Amino acid sequence: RTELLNVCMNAKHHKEKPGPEDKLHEQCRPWRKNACCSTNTSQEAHKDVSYLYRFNWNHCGEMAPACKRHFIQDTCLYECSPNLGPWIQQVDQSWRKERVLNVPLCKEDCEQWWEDCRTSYTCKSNWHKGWNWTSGFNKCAVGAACQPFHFYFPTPTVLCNEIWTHSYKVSNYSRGSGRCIQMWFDPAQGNPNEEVARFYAAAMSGT
Ligand SMILES: Nc1nc2[nH]c(CCNc3ccc(C(=O)N[C@@H](CCC(=O)O)C(=O)O)cc3)cc2c(=O)[nH]1
């Protein structure tokens, strides 16, 4: 891994290389200029128990729209961003050779994500391992474990870090500091992650 900019990780769905995709679905739209995902990938992002991972958001009763939308953006960011290089690593599992680890999510993105989920419900604090997939999609391990979302994710930083086994590492930096990744941004104002990736690829450069 010598070049960490304008590159796609090697997971279950990514393309080999970044590239224009003017047909991306609704929330994935800000990556139409340069994406790692396909029209279909972005399309399944937005759906319940998707073709992507058969993942069930409504494992603890219906998940509130205001919350689910954040998960859809995350999915977009993970499946579409070309600027995640500096945090790519190898792990070698049955469904992805590579993945991202300790992405410095902008303080607010995390807080807002945390905030919008207050009303929703979950049963696990780790959404990568532990689900009963018998049914065809992930169901609750201990069916009676269903608690308020903030019960398993007490603070924002807990949510963003632990829910995806440390794919994020919530930065102290705020949106626009040039030092953290935004999973929400206005494409009309340009892709702010492009400068963030470039910065961090230099701070860890050489050996
Ligand atoms: N930011 C960010 N978002 C992300 N979204 C996703 C999507 C990832 N969803 C899935 C989570 C769990 C499963 C699953 O079958 N688990 C098994 C064990 C999984 C395994 O080790 O083989 C279990 O329950 O025991 C499938 C998809 C990743 C991911 C990520 O890495 N980062």
UniProtKB/Swiss-Prot annotation:
Effect of residue 95 to A: Moderately reduced affinity for folate
GO MF: folic acid binding; folic acid receptor activity; signaling receptor activity
Consequence recorded when altering residue 74 to A: Strongly reduced affinity for folate
Tissue expression profile of the protein: Primarily expressed in tissues of epithelial origin. Expression is increased in malignant tissues. Expressed in kidney, lung and cerebellum. Detected in placenta and thymus epithelium.
Keywords: Cell membrane, Cytoplasmic vesicle, Disulfide bond, Endosome, Folate-binding, Glycoprotein, GPI-anchor, Lipoprotein, Membrane, Neurodegeneration, Receptor, Secreted, Signal, Transport
Effect of residue 128 to A: Moderately reduced affinity for folate
GO terms of biological process kind: anterior neural tube closure; axon regeneration; cardiac neural crest cell migration involved in outflow tract morphogenesis; cell adhesion; cellular response to folic acid; folic acid metabolic process; folic acid transport; fusion of sperm to egg plasma membrane involved in single fertilization
Membrane topology: Lipid-anchor; GPI-anchor; GPI-like-anchor
Effect of residue 167 to A: Moderately reduced affinity for folate
Lipidation (GPI-anchor amidated serine): 205
Disulfide-bond pairs as recorded: 8-36, 28-76, 37-80, 60-146, 67-117, 106-180, 110-160, 123-140
Disease: Neurodegeneration due to cerebral folate transport deficiency: An autosomal recessive neurodegenerative disorder resulting from brain-specific folate deficiency early in life. Onset is apparent in late infancy with severe developmental regression, movement disturbances, epilepsy and leukodystrophy.
Cited function: Binds to folate and reduced folic acid derivatives and mediates delivery of 5-methyltetrahydrofolate and folate analogs into the interior of cells. Has high affinity for folate and folic acid analogs at neutral pH. Exposure to slightly acidic pH after receptor endocytosis triggers a conformation change that strongly reduces its affinity for folates and mediates their release. Required for normal embryonic development and normal cell proliferation.
Family listed: Belongs to the folate receptor family.
Name the UniProt record assigns to this protein: Folate receptor alpha
Full-protein residues shown: 30 to 235 of 257
